[PDB]
Each structure stands twice: as C-alpha cells, then as structure tokens.
RNA sequence: AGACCCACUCCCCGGCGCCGGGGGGCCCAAGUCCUUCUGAUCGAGGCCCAGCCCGUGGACGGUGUGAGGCCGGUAGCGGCCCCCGGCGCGCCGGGCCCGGGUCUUCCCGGAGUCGGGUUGCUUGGGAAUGCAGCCCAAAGCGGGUGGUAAACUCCAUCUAAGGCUAAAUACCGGCACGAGACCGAUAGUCAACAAGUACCGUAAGGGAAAGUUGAAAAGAACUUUGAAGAGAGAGUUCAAGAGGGCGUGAAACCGUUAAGAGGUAAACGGGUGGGGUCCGCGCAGUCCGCCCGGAGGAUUCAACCCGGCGGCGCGGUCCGGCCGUGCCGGCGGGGCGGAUCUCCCGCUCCCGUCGGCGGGGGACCGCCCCCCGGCCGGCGACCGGCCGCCGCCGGGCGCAUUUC
RNA sequence: CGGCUACCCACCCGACCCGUCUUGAAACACGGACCAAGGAGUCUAACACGUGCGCGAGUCGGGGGCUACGAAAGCCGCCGUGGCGCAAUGAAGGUGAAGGCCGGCGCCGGCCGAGGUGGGAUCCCGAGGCCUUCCAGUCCGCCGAGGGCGCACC
RNA sequence: GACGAGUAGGAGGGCCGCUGCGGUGAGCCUUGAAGCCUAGGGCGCGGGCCCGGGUGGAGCCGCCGCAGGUGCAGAUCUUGG
C-alpha cells in the first residue's frame, strides 16, 4: 500500500530522493537496452555473456510433441506404485516381481541415478539409459520396451 | 485512475480454510467473544447449540 | 462440522483432501509450563539485587 | 431490506423521483392517515387528501383538537390549506399557512362514487391479506 | 490440547435438553489472528467495484 | 489457555482504550482497570472482582468458579458484603489469602474495595 | 437405374376454434401511546407478569432534526383488472403417397483457374507465408499440402478456383435499468443552473464564469428626513448577528475605538525589566493511616447453632462418568482407499463347448466410525455425588472493659 | 500573591532574504507584491533481492463447472489439462548423473555398501571435586583435565 | 557504561496530519456537531493535540486493521481576490 511506501517520507526533501547535482531526468541512458554494444558494453559483458550473435542450426517448424519425453529416476521409481506393492513383493516367497508401467504414470524415459533397493522388478518403459538398465540387471530385474 | 487497477486479490485455499478454522476455534473461547464485545454474560454456554 | 473440516485423526469426508492444521505447540499454558519441577530444578539462582 | 433488483435504493434517484413526480403521483404521495373512527369503520389506514375533507392538525404550531375543512390542495408545494389555519401578513390580509398531509388526520371523508370504490378495494385487499395470513 | 468436551443442546424454551454431542476438533484448531487478518484483508478486496 | 488468549486480547479487545499516552481495559473484572496480563479478568481460569453493590451501600465481590469455564452464565458467583470498612477488608483479605484464589491481586482488590467504600459515603 | 428381399404410412403447414410467460394499471401490517426539551419534533424516559404493536415488511425517500410503526414504498410462491405470447387439444382445406438391406450396370465435377517467372506490399514464415500487377499459362490413376531450393522414388492427407447456416464472441453510439472502499461546485463530463448557452473568429472551429434566504415569504404594514439611492423607528421570524446573488463567513486588504512605542528601514534569536489581558471562584492554607485521652450514639465483637455458596490432593489408594493428537486384546457391526489377489453377467472371433475384453461379486491390506473388556495420562482448553479442611453470606444465641 | 509560556514596549549581545544551480551566493545571478484554493515518483506488466504466511517434491484453480450485502463465499479431483520445480549437457544426430572386496571359468555367484581431510556452534563419556563435628558411604544434581560423533557452512 | 555534527543519499519510530472502508467505544450530539475567531489554560523537543470564551444549526470523533487522487513557499506555477 502507498501508506508504507518511501514516498510518504520523502515529503519536505527537495529532490525527492533523486539527487541535486544530476537531476532525475527522463532517460539519461537511452530507452530499454539501448547502446548494449556502445556504452553498456561493460554491463552486457560482465553480466550477459553470449548475448550477441547467432549459434547453431535453425529449426523452422518446431513442435514440442515430437521431442516430448519426460524422465524419471530409479530413486523415485518405487514412488510411482503404492507402498503395499513393495511390501507384498518383499514379503513374497514365490519370487514373483511387480511390474512397473512408468508410461501409465506419465514418464517415457527411465534414468538410473539413485540407489535401487534389493528387490526384483519389471520396468516397462519406452527408453532406458545404459546405467539404468545395468542397475536393474545388477539388482535383479527385467526391462520391457513399449511403443 | 484506470479501470484495470488490480482490484482483486486471490488467496490460497489451504490458508482460506486455515482462517475459518481458526475463526471457529476462537468462537468457543469466552475471552475472545467478550473481547469482540458481544453481550454474552448470561448465555448458558458459548458453544450455543440449539435443537 | 467434523465431516466438513475433519478430525485430527480423521480427514475431511466432504473435501477432496484436507485435515486440521497441526499445532506448532500443544501445551499453550506458559505459566503452568514454567511453574513445574522439571524446569525449575534445572535453573540458576536469580539475581534480583539492583546495583 | 429490499430484494427486487428493479426498485432503486439510491438516495439521489429517490429524491429526484419524488421532487419531479407528476401530479397524478403527487396525489397518491400526499395522503393523510384516517382517524381512529374512520380506520375502524372503513378498514383503511390512509387515503389521499382531497379538496373538501374535514381534517385536524397533529404536529406543528397550529396543532390541536379544532376541526377544519380543506380549501385547496397545492400539490406543487406538497401543501394543503385549511379553513382556519392561517396567519396575517404585514398589511393585515390573512393568508393560509401550508401544512403537509403527513401531519394531517382526516376526520370526515367527502365520499363520492369513486371515493367509495377506492375504499372498498382497499378494504377488500387488506381483508384477503389478513385471511391469507392465517 | 487433546481433550474433547461434551457440549449439550438447549431446547427452544432455554433449559438444557438431554442431547449432548462432543465438541468437534475444529474448535481446538490453532488460533492465528495474523492469518485471519491477512485472509480478511485480501478477501475483502474481491467484492470491490472499480472506480 | 491464558497466554494464547492474551496474545490476541492485548491489542484487539473492545475493552481496550488508548489515549493521552495511556491505555486501560474496561472489562468487568479488571482490578486497577488497566490493561495487563496480571489484572485481566477474562483470560484467567480463576478471577476476582470488586464492584459497588446495587444499592448505594456495600460491595459485591465476584468470583469465578472452576467447573463452568465455558459456561459464562454460571461461571461467576456474586457475594454482597454490607458491613463496616474494617470487617469488609478482613473478609476480602481472608477470602483471597486463605483460599489461595489468585493471591497475586489481593492487595489490589483491597485497594479497590476501600476506594468504593470511601466513595459510597456522603461527600462533604 | 434395374432385379430380389424386408418395410412404414402420420409428415407438414395454414384458416377457424376450446385449455391450464411477459407488458402495464389499482391495492394490501404495525404508536403520531403517556410525560418531557424545542420554533417544529423524527430528540430523551416509560409502555407489566402479551419485557408498547408489526415483522416473509428494521432498504430508501419525504414529512418544520437524526422515524421500522405519519405518508409512498419496502417483504411476500400477496390480491384484483386489461393486452399479448411460446405450449396441449379439436375440426377444416389442400400438399406427398414417400422407406431400409443385398446383387447387377452406368456416372462422377467448378480454367485466364491453379501453377511457373518477375515486380511491389504484408507476414514470424526464413531459395520468396499471404495478397496484387504484367508475361507464360495447363493435367486428369490429376491437382494441392507434407515450414531449405532441385531431381528420382515409395507414402500420408484433402479435393481449390460456386453458395447458405443460429450457438458460444465484441459494444466508450441508442432505449430502460441497478450498483460503487470514486468525485463533492477551482473536484467530478466542457456543462449539477435558460451549456456546447453566452461570447470571439469570414470560415474551418474555439468556448466559459455561474448552487445554497427562510420550516413556512411570514419578502419588512405603518411613522419620520430626503427627489431618490438610502437611513432612523416599528414589525415578521427562535434568528435579520438570515433582508431578494440573502447557510457558514478565514486570509491578504481598509476604517474606527482602546493600549504602547517611534531620528540608525522593517523584522528576528538569547536574556531580563515594565505595562495590560484574563486564569488560579486563591488571600489564614493539604491531609491520610496507627496509637493515647475526653465527650457521646448503636441492637454490636469474639466464640457457638442452622441453611446456602465457593476453594482446597481432602481421600498417599472414596465412588461414578468423559476424553487422548495413548496403547492392547475382537468366535464384534460398518464406511473410505488400494498399481494385493481371485464366482456371476454383458461384448467379439470358432463348432451348449475350448481358448479373449468390460462390468459386478468375494477374499486381503491400510485408515477411520461405533460396541465390549484391560492398562497409562488428563479433567489447569475437558467433572459429577459423599467425606475432610478452610473461607464467605444470611438468619439466631450472643449484651456491652468486646465491636462499629 | 503566583502565571516561564501567549499581547505590547525598553535595554545588552548576536543577527545580510528565502529557494535553486554552483568549487565558491546576502550577492551588481535567476524565480518571488500579498492572500485563499489546486499542484507534482501514481497505476499496469516483467525481473531480481530481502521479509511475512500456507503447503511442501510437490505447489497453484488464475480458465470453466456445481450451489440486499452476494459481481461475494463454498465446492470440483476421473475438471491439475497447464505453468513452475523435480536433470543437465550438445549446434544437432543424441546422451543423460559412486564403487570396492571374495571364489570359479573379460564373464558369472556372494559380501560391504553411497566419499576423504582441516576448521567447525552445539551434543556424549568422565582423572576428580562442590564442606557443618569426623570417618566409610549411596542417590539426585553441578563444574571440570582430557577424549569422541561431529549441524550448517568455508 | 560509551556516544550524540551533517549536504546529496539510505534506514527506522511516529499515541504526527487528511479522506473513505471493515470492526469496535450500550461513543458524542438541537440542554448544540463540523467550520471559524480568540490578549484564555495547557501538553508534547517536534509533526501537532486537548480543554475555556463568541458565531453555527446537523452532523462528528477515539482505538484495531485496510485503501489512497493523503501534507506546499516558491516552479517568469493554474484560478480567484
Ligand atoms: Mg536531504
Ligand atoms: Mg533513490
Ligand atoms: Mg537543483
Ligand atoms: Mg545522473
Ligand atoms: Mg526515471
Ligand atoms: Mg563507438
Ligand atoms: Mg415489492
Ligand atoms: Mg428524515
Ligand atoms: Mg422512542
Ligand atoms: Mg424512514
Ligand atoms: Mg420507532
Ligand atoms: Mg405504512
Ligand atoms: Mg503499403
Ligand atoms: Mg518424396
Ligand atoms: Mg469446393
Ligand atoms: Mg467451397
Ligand atoms: Mg456466409
Ligand atoms: Mg451489488
Ligand atoms: Mg461554482
Ligand atoms: Mg465552496
Ligand atoms: Mg466544473
Ligand atoms: Mg464560484
Ligand atoms: Mg452564497
Ligand atoms: Mg458557498
Ligand atoms: Mg443564529
Ligand atoms: Mg443562519
Ligand atoms: Mg439550514
Ligand atoms: Mg454570507
Ligand atoms: Mg493611539
Ligand atoms: Mg550587536
Ligand atoms: Mg537555480
Ligand atoms: Mg546544470
Ligand atoms: Mg562559475
Ligand atoms: Mg542562495
Ligand atoms: Mg558584485
Ligand atoms: Mg541580470
Ligand atoms: Mg536560470
Ligand atoms: Mg522578480
Ligand atoms: Mg492547499
Ligand atoms: Mg524471499
Ligand atoms: Mg515457461
Ligand atoms: Mg547527529
Ligand atoms: Mg479518496
Ligand atoms: Mg490574531
Ligand atoms: Mg435545516
Ligand atoms: Mg501557496
């Protein structure tokens, strides 16, 4: 609110908090990003490196659906399915392993980052990382690819 | 003054329910109701439930 | 009211997912807390001699 | 409180509609309450003032129990003039003093063919209202 | 706290009736005047016509 | 509780009144009639009160019981004392000290009772 | 279109005529009750043991203040009257005697148009997104599109150059409305008033200032000097200290009266002195407790009896209830959720059956509600009945070396 | 009789007219006869930082829908579509975040398992001691040589 | 216990001031509100505020929060005198 702003305590001071030698003029340094190459060179090089110039190829008609591929990690892999699935699989004596369809959850690619608990799984995903697959194989499990 | 001043403010629903829950809880404390100023001295009990 | 805002151990039956906000402190009686043997025993001697 | 969205509650609009009301609305606005005998007889609480009604004065400097007949109804000033409610001017000529119908109680109605049917309609409406109540 | 009292129900005549229901846990929710004031301040602006 | 209610009442109650660099509390059971956590008459489980009687003589002492904390109608018991000043002071002093009923403000109650007693007598 | 099978008649108007959603009109509750101010009350007190009356009506406005009940209205799935409307029936005239599946045979498309070259504008469209001018200017298993120009080669998707169509959508013009954390006559539209008026410019155009008598004009009869403006009386009003641009009436400015001062322009800060204005209702000067002494007056103290109230861990461990944001047991009766498993029904392929999907049901687990039993804690956010102690109040006995 | 203060006068000392620009203003620098009213860092959007509140690897109904003040308020959850965050890097094709030990023939089975050092607020242990006559003596605490597991953070 | 200067500039406290809104004072008020004047009594360092006297006739304020078209000595400032 304007009650608590600084302008309420600036009344009585001639310059209104803007200086007496250099008055608060309209646009002493140009409009917007003016003179980035000329008189704002130091600021645009000390704080915006790479700002000037092009790089890379140009993709004219880019559609995000083609490149849409959310990823999940093995630490969160068990979080997708309910707790009772994991506890029953751990208690299970016949060696049956739960099947985790990460696609139904909404992740296409599985990346292996965290520690995977010692428990057989069947991860049914769309893509797999090399380390993710070898962790699943090492802990004991299967990887199923779906389209 | 322009018509498109930000008249309306939105609040999170969790704290919306927080406030009314606190209001109801405070409504059962005789000190906080007399502090509000309602004449409640001879009321049989503050959580006034009727048939 | 209990079905609206839920109990401490029972969530609200009419809201999608809501429960009463937990207290930051339970025993709010500060005087009773201070005037207990457990705290008073582990205290230093007072110094009320104004110099 | 009022719930009809087509009826104003604004002070300015109500004042404008009152001070610019046409004469046929001025007649209904300038209505005086009936006496206790009249209301217990015709079952009507109030009626618009007319030219030839015997009325009293309830509030003001000229209030009392004396009974006087109206002489004219100056609806432009929201004022009626009575038979003997008057004061002298500087030159000595007597001119009547305007009295609002709100502070006037009708003692005897100058009932006519139209006046009787108005009273019967008002009595009928309030009787069916009371019957609907219970 | 943790207790849950038993609030009686009064009839129309004034005297207490035999019906007696427990106090809902909402009435023991934390009292936060800061949150109530914040919510009231922000929500009272939503029924404001522009000028 | 008590501190929980005080943190709300300390600056929001209708009895609160601030002017001329001073603040007071007009709650019905406030000895010394000043806003403080010690003398508040609504946020404490046990409370005393000294008021003039209905007649121009005597003093009515109001005490808050233990059971009906949430029942304001029966929460207070009013006892009327109509006797000499010394006896009235002794009665109130015994009532607070020997019952251990909020002994923090027994002297304030005695001061208020004495002030009411001297005010009730005819003024020269 | 032909053949073979199945297959329906009630579709549609419009003329006439009988039935149960709007546009306006007229209306509907309750104090002018008793005292009391006032100039007037709508101000203030009371209206019982019907805590004045009504209230589905305590919005608003007016009425000589500030009114739920004086009036209009207000609430109402409240009432009456007139006009018209979308429905649900009847006849009447005609209009059409119309449909689906299988098989056989034929047909099927919009040209100065697309497209290509160039130029110009536009777009984010970048070897040219869209549009237009000029030139060339077609094809039909063809043409267009498939965001990098081109050639070849398989694909995917539509059918351009003909047309119609409510709905959701925009509204600072217009009609009638409602509202506002807005403005309150130098503000707010330029304009609250005879305002786009007066007024200026040849013209296009420019464009103001300007609200408040009083409740009611009751607008000052009449006398007196003067020609009159205008005074002096008188009178109206509570009030002319409201007298026709008249509510309130500041400052700059001016006159008069009173006080003081005055040849270094006036004026200013510190320090005093003098004079005025009023203030201290001052001018024999505060009392407040305890004790001593003297004059007094009480229905009088302490201690006991009865009744009531309250507090207290009383009772180390009285009895009974309630809760746990504590737990345990359950040959208990349930709701929620589960990505924990597993008899019935519906659907599709095959000859009532073997092999599939969806739904329902059952079991299992987690949480929660209720009932029973057993412990822990609390009742100081949440107590009841006895007993014990203490305090207080009332009524007695108390009788003056006590008490006031 | 008292009243510093607010009215006037007299005297002693001090005392250049304000604002603004300027290194330098009382300036022969500019604005200023006096008075009244109006009058100038507001609003929208974006970002960053810090602080308050709710929830928390989740969070948000802002759009839509269901039910005088109220054009409010409540609810949706199989309306979380979507934004932000939970993963970065490369122009792109893409890739995408500990390992060690043991036995057999680079591969198989089992075990340990998600860094180290220096400084690190706090916490844990305790060589003894904190006296009422003196000795042995226990329990509840308190201080403490020294030794540790070390928050955050560098 | 120590310290106290200050332009531009920054921050904090305002029981300093104005207008309106939500609550609150069984608030004030025709037995006289706002406004205005006052050689009156004062308080607060100060922003300013409370009482006394005169006109006024109809509205007004304190506290807790919210919001701003919120404070003038100037700008050859605008309007009016
Ligand atoms: Mg400054
Ligand atoms: Mg600045
Ligand atoms: Mg400057
Ligand atoms: Mg500069
Ligand atoms: Mg700027
Ligand atoms: Mg250069
Ligand atoms: Mg109506
Ligand atoms: Mg009125
Ligand atoms: Mg009354
Ligand atoms: Mg009214
Ligand atoms: Mg009334
Ligand atoms: Mg009426
Ligand atoms: Mg062009
Ligand atoms: Mg191709
Ligand atoms: Mg076509
Ligand atoms: Mg077409
Ligand atoms: Mg068309
Ligand atoms: Mg509205
Ligand atoms: Mg004007
Ligand atoms: Mg004005
Ligand atoms: Mg104007
Ligand atoms: Mg004017
Ligand atoms: Mg005027
Ligand atoms: Mg005026
Ligand atoms: Mg007057
Ligand atoms: Mg006047
Ligand atoms: Mg007036
Ligand atoms: Mg005037
Ligand atoms: Mg003179
Ligand atoms: Mg000198
Ligand atoms: Mg300058
Ligand atoms: Mg310069
Ligand atoms: Mg120079
Ligand atoms: Mg200067
Ligand atoms: Mg010079
Ligand atoms: Mg010059
Ligand atoms: Mg200059
Ligand atoms: Mg000049
Ligand atoms: Mg001004
Ligand atoms: Mg932050
Ligand atoms: Mg984004
Ligand atoms: Mg300093
Ligand atoms: Mg404003
Ligand atoms: Mg003066
Ligand atoms: Mg008036
Ligand atoms: Mg000025």
Query: What are the C-alpha distances in Å from D112 to residues B31, D31, D115, F2?
Result: 68, 17, 5, 77
Chain F contact probe: residue of C26, C27, C30, C35 with most F CBs at under 10 A: C30
Which nucleotide is closest, CA of C15 to its C1'? H75
Which nucleotide is closest, CA of A82 to its C1'? G339
This entry's atomic model was obtained through cryo-EM
Whether C4 contacts chain B with CB within 8 A: no
Which nucleotide is closest, CA of E50 to its C1'? G180
The resolution of the experimental structure, rounded to one decimal in Å, is 3.1
Residue A16 CA and nucleotide H22 C1' are separated, in Å, by 20
Chain F stretch 79-118, residues whose beta carbon is closer than 8 A to a beta carbon of chain E: none
Ligand number nearest to the C-alpha of D46? 12
Counting other chains too, the contacts that F58-66 makes at CB distance below 8 Å and 24 or more residues apart are F58/F82, F58/F83, F58/F120, F59/F88, F59/F113, F59/F116, F59/F117, F61/F92, F61/F95, F61/F109, F61/F113, F62/F28, F62/F29, F63/F95, F63/F101, F64/F29
Residue F21 CA and nucleotide H3 C1' are separated, in Å, by 26
User: Would residue D64 be called left, alpha or beta, if left means φ above 0 and alpha means ψ between -120 and 50 degrees?
Assistant: left
Counting other chains too, the contacts that F83-86 makes at CB distance below 8 Å and 24 or more residues apart are F83/F58, F85/F114, F85/F117
CA distance E27 to C4: 13
Beta-carbon contacts below 8 Å between E and F: 5
Distance from the B35 Cα atom to the nearest Cα atom in chain E, whole angstroms: 13
How far does CA A3 lie from the centroid of its chain? 39
Helices of type H across A2-147: 41-46, 77-80, 83-91, 102-105, 130-139
Residues in B touching F71 (Cβ below 8 Å): 44-45
Do B31 and F12 lie within an 8 Å CB cutoff?
A: no
CA distance F106 to F91: 11
Which neighbouring-strand residues pair with D73?
D80
Residues in E touching B12 (Cβ below 8 Å): none
Quote the DSSP letter at residue B3: T
Per-residue three-class SS string for chain F: CCHHHHHHHCCCCCCEEEECCEEEECCCCCHHHCCCCCCCCCCCCCCEEEEECCCCCCEEEEEECCCCCCCHHHHEEEEEECCCHHHHHHHHHHHHHCCCCCHHHHHHHHHHHHHHHHHHCCCC
Whether C30 contacts chain F with CB within 8 A: yes
């Amino acid at each position: 609110p304007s009650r608590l702003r600084k302008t309420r305590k600036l009344r009585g001071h001639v310059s209104h908090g803007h200086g007496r030698i250099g008055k608060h003029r309209k646009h002493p340094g140009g409009r917007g990003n003016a003179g980035g190459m000329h008189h704002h060179r130091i600021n645009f090089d000390k704080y915006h490196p790479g700002y000037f110039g092009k790089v890379g190829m140009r993709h004219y008609h880019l559609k995000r659906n083609q490149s849409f591929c959310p990823t999940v990690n093995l630490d969160k892999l068990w979080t997708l399915v309910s707790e009772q699935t994991r506890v029953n699989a751990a208690k299970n004596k016949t060696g049956a392993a739960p099947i985790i369809d990460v696609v139904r959850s909404g992740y296409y690619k599985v990346l292996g980052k965290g520690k995977l608990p010692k428990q057989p799984v069947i991860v049914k995903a769309k893509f797999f990382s090399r380390r993710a697959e070898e962790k699943i194989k090492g802990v004991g499990g299967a990887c199923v690819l779906v389209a | 003054t322009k018509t498109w001043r930000r008249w309306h403010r939105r609040v999170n629903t969790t704290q919306k329910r927080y406030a009314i829950c606190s209001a109801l809880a405070a409504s059962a404390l005789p000190a906080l109701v007399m502090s509000k100023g309602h004449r409640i001295e001879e009321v049989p009990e503050l959580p006034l439930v009727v048939e | 009211l209990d079905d609206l805002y839920g109990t401490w151990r029972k969530a609200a039956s009419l809201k999608s997912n809501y429960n009463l906000p937990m207290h930051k402190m339970l025993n709010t009686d500060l005087s009773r807390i201070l005037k207990s043997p457990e705290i008073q025993r582990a205290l230093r001697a007072p110094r009320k001699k104004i110099h | 409180m009022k719930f009809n969205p087509f009826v104003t509650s604004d002070r300015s609009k109500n004042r404008k509609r009152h001070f610019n009301a046409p004469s046929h609305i001025r007649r209904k606005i300038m209505s005086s309450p009936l006496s206790k005998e009249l209301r217990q007889k015709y079952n009507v609480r109030s009626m618009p003032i007319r030219k030839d009604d015997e009325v009293q004065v309830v509030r003001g400097h000229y209030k009392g129990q004396q009974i006087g007949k109206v002489v004219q109804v100056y609806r432009k000033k929201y004022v009626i003039y009575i038979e003997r409610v008057q004061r002298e001017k500087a030159n000595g000529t007597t001119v009547h003093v305007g009295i609002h119908p709100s502070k006037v109680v009708i003692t005897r109605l100058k009932l006519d063919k139209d006046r009787k049917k108005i009273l019967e309609r008002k009595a009928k409406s309030r009787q069916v209202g009371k019957e609907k109540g219970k | 706290a943790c207790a849950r009292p038993l609030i009686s129900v009064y009839s129309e005549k004034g005297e207490s009736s035999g019906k007696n229901v427990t106090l809902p846990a909402v009435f023991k929710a934390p009292i936060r005047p800061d949150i109530v004031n914040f919510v009231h301040t922000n929500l009272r602006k939503n029924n404001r016509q522009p000028y | 509780s008590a501190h929980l209610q005080w943190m709300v009442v300390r600056n929001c109650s209708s009895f609160l009144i601030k002017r001329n660099k001073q603040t007071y509390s007009t709650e019905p059971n406030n000895l010394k009639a000043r806003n403080s956590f010690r003398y508040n008459g609504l946020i404490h489980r046990k409370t005393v009160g000294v008021e003039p009687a209905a007649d121009g003589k005597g003093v009515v002492v109001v005490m808050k019981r233990r059971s009906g904390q949430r029942k304001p109608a029966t929460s207070y018991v009013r006892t009327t004392i109509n006797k000499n000043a010394r006896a009235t002071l002794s009665s109130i002093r015994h009532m607070i000290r020997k019952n251990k009923y909020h002994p923090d403000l027994r002297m304030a109650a005695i001061r208020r009772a004495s002030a009411i007693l001297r005010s009730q007598k005819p003024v020269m």
